[PDB]
Amino acid sequence: RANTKIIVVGGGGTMGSSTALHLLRAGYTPSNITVLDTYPIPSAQSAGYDLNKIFGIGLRNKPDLQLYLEALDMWKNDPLFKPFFHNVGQMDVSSTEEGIKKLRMRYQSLLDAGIGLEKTNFLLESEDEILAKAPHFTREQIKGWKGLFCGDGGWLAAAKAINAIGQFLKEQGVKFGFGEAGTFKKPLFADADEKTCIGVETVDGTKYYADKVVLAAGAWSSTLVDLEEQCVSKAWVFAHIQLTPAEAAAYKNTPVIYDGDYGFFIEPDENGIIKVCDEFPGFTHFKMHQPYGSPVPKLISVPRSHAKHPTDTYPHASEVTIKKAINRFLPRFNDKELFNRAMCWCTDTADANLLVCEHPRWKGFYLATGDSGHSFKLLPNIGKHVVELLEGRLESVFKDAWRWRPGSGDALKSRRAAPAKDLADMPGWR
Ligand SMILES: *Cc1cc2c(cc1C)nc1c(=O)[nH]c(=O)nc-1n2C[C@H](O)[C@H](O)[C@H](O)COP(=O)(O)OP(=O)(O)OC[C@H]1O[C@@H](n2cnc3c(N)ncnc32)[C@H](O)[C@@H]1O
């Protein structure tokens, strides 16, 4: 480990920073690790560059249970990550027939895991029970609502946690490249047959050589190399509203509130800011782009970066749905002004499992992407398994789920309600 050189492409991001962290913990020599990201860690265009994220339980795919438990343990006990986890719990709510059904079935799925999750997860069938966990609601507001309360979760101070990894990496003497000298252009090969990767070249022409390369470029991964449409990148949206300390006080330590027909909000941070998201299948930004491995040009959804273009917001349609979420959850704040309107990018696989594997042809080159919009929670632990993969030690439960799988389904729809619409058809964000 001490004599192996690793390049982590996108190391200023969620899966990338986690990987560089666990390389250091595993005893890799800091000077042998090179983080290449367009932006310095925490990357300003990273999906994890956010006031907060939700930490919650999900049992959709096979490794999800173990990954979640693994992450929880670390969010609660790892001194590096512990300050950034706010265990206020989460309550999912609904008042529709289909919505309440989904809540009940979800609850039952937790039980069917058979590990005792009913001890920290509760079905709330009455108004009183809902108001008890979320005193800021009014009784009239929640008429007909049912709730599912998960006591294990809460929210995460996202950018702060990635910055915490970054501080450590830099203290340790990890090598960095940012800007054009940090922006992956193509991999380097020993022979023209392309079967042995020996490094990467960035868009400025700078070459970096290493034993192994990890591609953790999030929503950009599919643009940089050909993933054969395994990964379709999509934008989700959020707005902010600012509360006074007096307005914020009713929401202190209140659970994350979610409703699948509206979206979610998180309690005001130390500055009185509430972030609100809607729920929708996402937006693509289609372009032709020549990834490598294609390397002919190919239509791929390419992120329109808010970091490189701060004057971008979100479509008009998103303004509507975000305001509906605010009316649903926070009607007393309907006249609050929305601001820091922005788009946040992820990349979906067909089955919403990760794409974490060695490239089929380019040995030495490893993919660590396919976050599918639900992987910030895995910040503390995902790097441990990326390292296991590098070392040939990744267990089958993860390896099989994360394997190279082109043609395994339509990633444009993925596991969501619909194929994503494209930003070219949604006016207002420019
Ligand atoms: C968008 C979004 C996502 C999200 C969320 C809400 C929104 C609005 N809420 C979540 C939640 O409540 N709970 C949760 O678990 N996840 C939530 N998410 C998803 C989460 O943000 C993403 O799953 C995760 O952050 C993605 O990580 P990933 O590592 O995959 O992506 P990234 O963090 O963006 O990192 C990518 C890095 O790559 C760098 N980059 C890009 N191009 C290059 C090149 N060419 N060379 C080098 N680096 C490159 C980017 O800069 C970035 O740093």
Numbering used by the authors: 4 to 433
From the publication, what sentences describe this entry?
A number of enzymes, termed fructosyl amino acid oxidase (FAOX), have reactivity for fructosyl amino acids as major substrates. Some of these enzymes, which also exhibit reactivity for fructosyl dipeptides as F-VH are specifically termed fructosyl peptide oxidase (FPOX). AnFPOX-15, which featured 11 amino acid replacements in AnFPOX-1 exhibited significant F-VH oxidation activity, whereas reactivity for longer fructosyl peptides such as fructosyl tripeptide (F-3P, Fru-VHL), fructosyl tetrapeptide (F-4P, Fru-VHLT) and F-6P was never observed. The overall structure of AnFPOX-15 consisted of two domains: an oxidoreductase FAD-binding domain with the topology of an incomplete anti-parallel β-barrel (two β-sheets with eight β-strands) and four α-helices at one side of the β-barrel; and a catalytic domain with two β-sheets (eight or two β-strands), and two long α-helices (helix 2 and 3) that locate at each side of the sheets, and some short helices.
The first-generation mutants, in which R61 was replaced with glycine or alanine, displayed significant oxidation activities for F-6P. To confirm the structural influence of the R61G mutation, the crystal structure of AnFPOX-15 R61G was determined. No other significant structural differences were found between AnFPOX-15 and AnFPOX-15 R61G (rmsd = 0.148 Å for 431 Cα atoms). As well as in the case of AnFPOX-15, no significant structural difference was observed between the ligand-free AnFPOX-15 R61G and AnFPOX-15 R61G/FSA (rmsd = 0.17 Å for 431 Cα atoms). From these observations, the generated R61G mutant acquired significant oxidation activity for F-6P, and the wider space of substrate gate in R61G mutant was confirmed via its crystal structure.
